[PDB]
Structure formats: structure tokens, C-alpha cells
């Protein structure tokens, strides 16, 4: 009976990232303290009108998970997950500023189940030396993003947050 269904308000104080809420979520704000484990499906596509998929967690079938700690994989994700309510499908339009460290993380996330383990850090140094002097990885995502950086769009579907440890 009433056309109006929303009211403007403030959120997403940090600049360089646009926020939209694709779907609602049940429950209050999740307990976000250091040590808590977070399980959250993610998908990263291009900001362009094509919106081609770069990384999808759904085809793999393994929802990526983290802990609330100083992994410093990407600060903006560490903020967005904290600034989220459980069971909330959401869309985030970041900018070229934050998405500088992305390509290496994308390579690691594509190769974590491909046959490479994160328990080693010398292989990454060897890869950096190869990139600097010897050769190039040649991966499509690396060429598309490292050579030309663009803003990205991230779909986040968090599953749950566990008690610490």
C-alpha cells in the first residue's frame, strides 16, 4: 500500500569502497573479536559492464574461511567482514586504491587447492625473483590486473562466525 520501503542513513564511512545490500540477514551483528573464525563465500568480478567472473567460490564448492587476526591478506576485506551482519548477501564496489595486493592473493587462492600449500614461503620468494629477473607467470588474472589496475566488485555471502579457537 505504501511505495516507500527504505530510509536514507549513513554507513560505509571509509572512502574508496561503495556498498550495496543485495539481500537481508537474520540475527544481530555477529561477535567480531580477535581469534574468531569466519566462514564466508566470496566472488570477485570486474567492475566493467561485462562483470566477468574472476574468482568464484561457488564452482569450487569450498567456502573460504579466515580467522580474526593479523593475516593482513587485504585490509578492506578485514573491514567489510567486520562491518557485516550474519547471513547477509552483499555487494561491495571497491576502487583501484585497495586492490593492489589482490593478484598475488588470487594466485594463492587459485593454487591453494590446485596442488600448492601455503606452509612454504620460499617458493613465493622464488616466484618473485623469477618475475623480477627471469620470466613471467603468464596467468590471465595477473596479466589483466597487474598490468592494468581497475576497481573491482565483490559479492560476499558470509556463512557463520565461530567461537575463538
Amino acid at each position: 500500500f505504501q511505495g516507500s520501503h527504505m530510509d536514507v542513513s549513513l554507513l560505509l564511512n571509509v572512502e574508496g569502497v561503495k556498498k550495496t545490500i543485495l539481500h537481508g540477514g537474520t540475527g544481530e551483528l555477529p561477535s567480531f573479536i580477535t581469534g574468531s573464525r569466519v566462514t564466508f563465500h566470496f566472488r570477485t568480478m570486474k567492475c566493467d559492464d561485462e562483470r566477468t567472473v574472476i574468482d568464484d567460490s561457488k564452482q569450487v564448492g569450498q567456502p573460504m574461511s579466515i580467522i580474526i587476526g593479523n593475516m593482513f591478506k587485504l585490509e578492506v576485506w578485514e573491514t567489510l567482514l567486520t562491518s557485516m551482519r550474519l547471513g547477509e548477501v552483499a555487494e561491495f564496489w571497491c576502487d583501484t586504491i585497495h586492490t593492489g595486493v589482490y593478484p598475488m592473493l588470487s594466485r594463492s587462492l587459485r593454487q591453494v587447492a590446485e596442488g600448492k600449500d601455503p606452509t612454504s614461503w620460499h617458493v613465493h620468494t622464488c616466484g618473485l625473483a623469477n618475475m623480477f629477473a627471469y620470466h613471467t607467470l603468464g596467468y590471465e588474472d595477473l596479466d589483466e590486473l597487474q598490468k592494468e589496475p581497475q576497481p573491482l566488485v565483490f559479492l560476499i555471502e558470509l556463512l557463520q562466525v565461530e567461537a575463538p579457537n
Binding site: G3, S4, H5, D7, S9, I21, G24, G25
Partner: protein, 629 residues
């Protein structure tokens, strides 16, 4: 090498295309025929200016509609200019050839004519309904002719010898059996009222009835289009008569704004403010029917939010234009930017009209009581015109009394040291007036604006400040009145003293109130519940928890963070602090704290999560009081 050619057109398929595809609704044929007839009259009237002797054939300019169910024939007679045999062959015979356009361009300089015809395909719309069309013509120059056709790709021209017409054209449509509903008087009247109501010339509907088999003549266009006349010369009685004829309401118009805009987009508009708001003003669901658009006195379309914003739909009236890019079906336009410019001008002139009307105190009171909801909806939506709409606001304030005052008057009475506009919203004037939140403010002599309608919440959702002064909701936390040194010293002393009580109360009501502290907005009530800075206000949250179509999960996204504000000078609070100092924990003190929180939640407008528990607690308290045992 290069062989030039000329375009062709398959006549039969083109005629079939015109008959089947151009026009959606088949009832528009009259709208077309009458329009032609209108031009047919206009020409002769112009030719009467330089040649009165040319009117010797007939001195009366009229249009007659004669339905004949005996033969199922619809006749339309006009004493217009008429068409010669050459005109019959050229203008009528050739599709998309408009002789009316040629006549218009042959005119000299600028003259008072507004011929409807522009395309040249209007007449064939008569085949939407009729299966055979006969046109009997009698021009003032040549003899009377008859033109017969059935849209079969050929037409017949015959030297007519029937009843003489003197001058003009009489068209007879042999309607098909399916479209026989247009022989009824009611259908014809409804169509004429919808489409051809404002045509200048008189039109009448001849009919045969019994009382003993008499002929009845009835004029269907008694009302004349006054927007063509100069707005200064028109009197209020004429405006009222026009409003009654247009809206079919006994009540007069409250106010009228008649203005013309010239230039690259020239149009005349006539807007009326209805005296009484309709019962079903909302729930239109695309049935706006507010501002009927006209081009050369012919109806085009209803403003389905194209010409007017949604909140301004309470206003009635007409908009008329002479030159306008028109659709083939004459039911829409080609460019929407033109409609946007029309909307800009209409909104500007509506705001000017409202500002002018604001002088009449009683009339403006009536208008406000009628359309304050629409005005506040406009404040919610129309962002560019927020200052003007805000100046049009009237409210009940603490110092106002029974009558309502504008925000400008509040600013005039606003104190020298004050730096904000303090407002409180609720569901009634009486409940708000006795509320605890405004006890301190009214005690210090600061005027407070009562906003006692649900839509007022949306009003403050957008209106952040007024005249360089910020709006502050009494209910919302952080209320900082101008404070002296002694007041700050007392506040610091009370904050220091009641720290343990605040900690204990926070511990007791865990996950129920985010922050418990002292306040400066309470003087008589012990405690109050205060909305956080970000979340929905208590009244707002209560309102939007009752929306018919709402997502329960979405409700949790903007829930308010409740704050408890206690009065350090209230005897109950001092006794509670003393008891809590006496006993670090006790059942009685916990019960009292829970009851106080429940009462504050009830008084603040929040609905209880479970009223049964509080009611049972009250019942037990009553039992203990009266000592039933």
C-alpha cells in the same frame, strides 16, 4: 551506371496497416472526425472575416450527431467549408496528404487560427468501426457530391441529388454489428465528454424518444475553455463554474493559478486546488487522472507521473499547448525532455501559487489541513525544492497554543543563545506535550515543535536543517543545551557520584540497554529511554515495524541502540543508589530496576517484547499492596 528512382507505396497494405496498427482503442474515431469537422468550421470562419457574403448559405456554425439504430448508421453533420470535387479527389483520396496543412501554410503572418490537422490520416480511423463510409458534401462554390467507400482500395465519387445540405459535410458511418454499442446515447456522451469536451463550436446530439415520439436535442459542450482567455479578465464565478464542470463537484475551487509561458516551448496552464481532499486520493495505482493534457483543445494523455510529481497529484487542472511533437495516434509525445521542462515550470509555478496563498490565513489553514501529508511527501522526495516546501510548513508548538505556526515564526521567537530547532515527534499532541523528554526544555523556556503524524518522521528524515539552523530531536541522545559553569560542575559531580549505580544498572540489564547514564533533559520523571545517534528513532522504529510489506530481517539492520537516562535529583533514583550501596545484590533492587526499565520502555513508545510479564509483575505488586495474601 547510376539509375535514380522514386519511392512507392503499396496502397492496400498501407491502408490495412493504418486500420489495424495505428490506433489501439477504437473509440477514438469520433475524436478524429470531430477534430476534422472543427477545422472545417475554422476555415469558413476565417473566410467569413474577409467575406461575410460567403456565410449567406448558413449563418449557424454547429455540429450535429445523429445515431439511427433503425439502419445502424451514425451521422455527423457540420455546416463547415465543405470540399469540392477536386478537394475530394486530392485531400480525401490521397493518404497522408493534409489539405488542412496546406491551407494553414497559405495563411498570412500570424492570425488567430489553431487548426488541429497536421498528419492527413485521421479520417481513415473511421474504418476502425464503420464498414462503409459515405460523405455528402456541399461546398459554397460547386455542386453537392457524394463520396462512398469501404476501405477496399477504391472510392466512388457521384453527383449527389438527395436532400440539399446548403453547405458543409455530412458523414454517415454504416457501423458493423460488433461496434453497435456506439449507437447508444450513453456511450456517445461519454466519448464526447472524454475527448471532444472543450471544442469551441457547439455540438449537439439529436435523438428520437417518446413522451409521443419527439426529437430531442442536447448540447454537450456548454462549458467553454477559459484558459484561452486572458487570466486578468476572468472572474472568480467563471473559475468556479469551470471547476464544477471539470470535476463534477458542488464545492468551488480553493485557489486557481492561470499562467502562460512563451518562447521555444509555449503553453498555457490552469491549476486548481480542490476545496476538499478526496477520500480515495491515494491508491490510484497509475490512475492519476489529475492534469489532463490538451493540444489545440484536444485531450492527449493523463499525467502518469510524467507531468507532475507523485506528491502533487492532489492538484487538478489543465495544460494546453499549440505546437508540440505529437504521436501518430495522438495519445503521447515523442520527447520526454519536453515533459521534464513542463514539470519544472509546473513545480515552480505551484510553489509560487502556494506562497501567494499562504497570505490568506484561514484559507491556508484549510489547505494545510487538507494536504499536509502531500506537502511532507514532497519534502521527502523533491530534493531541489526543499527550502520552499519547508517554508510552507505549519506546526503545533509548545508556545504556539491551539493554532499552528510556521518555522519562520519559531526562528523569530528563537532565543539569542539558542542554536538549533528542538522538535519531538509522537502519535498525539497531548501525549507529546506531557512527555518526559520535553520537561526540562519547556522548564527552561525553549519552544518545541510537536510533530504528531507518522509521516512527520519522513519529514525529519530529509529536512536536516532550516534557515542555517539544525533540527534536533529531543528524543535523540547528545542533547546539549547551552550550559553555565555551575550546571557543568553539577553534571560532573553527579557523573562522579552515580558511577557505581550506572555500572550496576548496566550489569543488570545486559544486552537490553547499550549505555546507562545520567541526563540533563529530565526534571520530574525518574528514567527515560533514548534512541542512539544512528539508529531509527523510537517512534520511527515503531512506525516501520508496522509496515504491511516489510522484511523482518531488514528490521534488524537499523534497530535503535537503547540508552537509559536517569535523573540524579529524583528521590527514587537516590533511594535506589542508597539501597544498591547497602547491598551489592538483592532481589528487590533487581525487580525495581526491571520494573523501572519496563515503565520507561512503555512510556517512551517502545512496544514490550512481552507485555504479559510486566502485567503479571504489576498484578503481583497490586496483590502485595492491598495484602490479599
Amino acid at each position: 551506371e547510376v539509375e535514380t528512382f522514386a519511392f512507392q507505396a503499396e496502397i492496400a497494405q498501407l491502408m490495412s496497416l493504418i486500420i489495424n496498427t495505428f490506433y489501439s482503442n477504437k473509440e477514438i474515431f469520433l475524436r478524429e472526425l470531430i477534430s476534422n469537422a472543427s477545422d472545417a468550421l475554422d476555415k469558413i470562419r476565417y473566410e467569413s472575416l474577409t467575406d461575410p457574403s460567403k456565410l449567406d448559405s448558413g449563418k449557424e456554425l454547429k455540429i450535429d450527431i445523429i445515431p439511427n439504430p433503425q439502419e445502424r448508421t451514425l451521422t455527423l453533420v457540420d455546416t463547415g467549408i465543405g470540399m469540392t470535387k477536386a478537394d475530394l479527389i486530392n485531400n480525401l483520396g490521397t493518404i497522408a496528404k493534409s489539405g488542412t496543412k496546406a491551407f494553414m501554410e497559405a495563411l498570412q503572418a500570424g492570425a488567430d487560427i489553431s487548426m488541429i490537422g497536421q498528419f492527413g490520416v485521421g479520417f481513415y480511423s473511421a474504418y476502425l468501426v464503420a464498414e462503409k463510409v459515405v460523405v455528402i458534401t456541399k461546398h459554397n462554390d460547386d455542386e453537392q457530391y457524394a463520396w462512398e467507400s469501404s476501405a477496399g482500395g477504391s472510392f466512388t465519387v457521384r453527383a449527389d441529388h438527395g436532400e440539399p445540405i446548403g453547405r458543409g459535410t455530412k458523414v454517415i458511418l454504416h457501423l458493423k454489428e460488433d461496434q453497435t454499442e456506439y449507437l447508444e446515447e450513453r456511450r456517445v456522451k461519454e466519448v464526447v465528454k472524454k475527448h471532444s469536451q472543450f471544442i469551441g463550436y457547439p455540438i449537439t446530439l439529436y435523438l428520437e424518444k417518446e413522451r409521443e415520439k419527439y426529437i430531442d436535442q442536447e448540447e454537450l459542450n456548454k462549458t467553454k475553455p477559459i484558459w484561452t482567455r486572458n487570466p486578468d479578465d476572468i472572474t472568480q464565478e467563471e473559475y468556479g463554474e469551470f471547476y464544477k464542470s471539470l470535476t463534477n463537484d458542488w464545492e468551488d475551487h480553493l485557489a486557481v493559478k492561470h499562467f502562460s509561458v512563451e518562447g521555444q516551448l509555449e503553453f498555457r496552464a490552469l491549476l486548481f486546488i480542490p476545496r476538499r481532499a478526496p477520500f480515495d486520493l491515494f491508491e490510484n495505482k497509475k490512475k492519476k487522472n489529475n492534469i489532463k493534457l490538451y493540444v489545440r483543445r484536444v485531450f492527449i494523455m493523463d499525467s502518469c507521473d510524467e507531468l507532475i510529481p507523485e506528491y502533487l497529484n492532489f492538484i487538478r487542472g489543465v495544460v494546453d499547448s499549440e505546437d508540440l511533437p505529437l504521436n501518430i495516434s495522438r495519445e503521447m509525445l515523442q520527447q520526454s525532455k519536453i515533459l521534464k521542462v513542463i514539470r519544472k515550470n509546473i513545480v515552480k509555478k505551484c510553489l509560487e501559487l502556494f506562497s501567494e496563498l499562504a497570505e490568506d490565513k484561514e484559507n491556508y489553514k484549510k489547505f494545510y489541513e487538507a494536504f499536509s501529508k502531500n506537502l511532507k511527501l514532497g519534502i521527502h522526495e523533491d530534493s531541489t525544492n526543499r527550502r520552499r516546501l519547508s517554508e510552507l510548513l505549519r506546526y503545533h508548538t509548545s508556545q504556539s497554543g491551539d493554532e499552528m505556526t510556521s518555522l519562520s515564526e519559531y526562528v523569530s521567537r528563537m532565543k539569542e543563545t539558542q542554536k538549533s530547532i528542538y522538535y519531538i515527534t509522537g502519535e498525539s499532541k497531548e501525549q507529546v506535550a506531557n512527555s518526559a523528554f520535553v520537561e526540562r526544555v519547556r522548564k527552561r523556556g525553549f519552544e518545541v515543535v510537536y510533530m504528531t503524524e507518522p509521516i512527520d518522521e519522513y519529514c525529519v528524515q530529509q529536512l536536516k536543517e532550516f534557515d542555517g539552523k539544525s533540527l534536533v530531536s529531543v528524543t535523540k541522545e547528545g542533547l546539549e543545551l547551552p550550559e553555565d559553569e555551575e550546571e557543568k560542575k553539577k553534571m560532573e559531580e553527579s557523573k562522579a557520584k552515580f558511577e557505581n549505580l550506572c555500572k550496576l544498572m548496566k550489569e543488570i540489564l545486559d544486552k537490553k540497554v547499550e549505555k546507562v547514564t545520567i541526563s540533563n533533559r529530565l526534571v520530574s520523571s525518574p528514567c527515560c529511554i533514548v534512541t542512539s545517534t544512528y539508529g531509527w528513532t523510537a517512534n520511527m522504529e515503531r512506525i516501520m515495524k508496522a509496515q504491511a510489506l516489510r522484511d523482518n530481517s531488514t528490521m534488524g539492520y537499523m534497530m535503535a541502540k537503547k540508552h537509559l537516562e536517569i535523573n540524579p535529583d529524583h528521590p527514587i533514583v537516590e533511594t535506589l543508589r542508597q539501597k544498591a550501596e547497602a547491598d551489592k545484590n538483592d532481589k528487590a533492587v533487581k525487580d525495581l530496576v526491571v520494573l523501572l526499565f519496563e515503565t520507561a520502555l512503555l512510556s517512551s513508545g517502545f512496544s514490550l517484547e512481552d507485555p504479559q510479564t510486566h502485567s503479571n509483575r504489576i498484578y503481583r505488586m497490586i496483590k502485595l499492596g492491598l495484602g490479599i495474601d
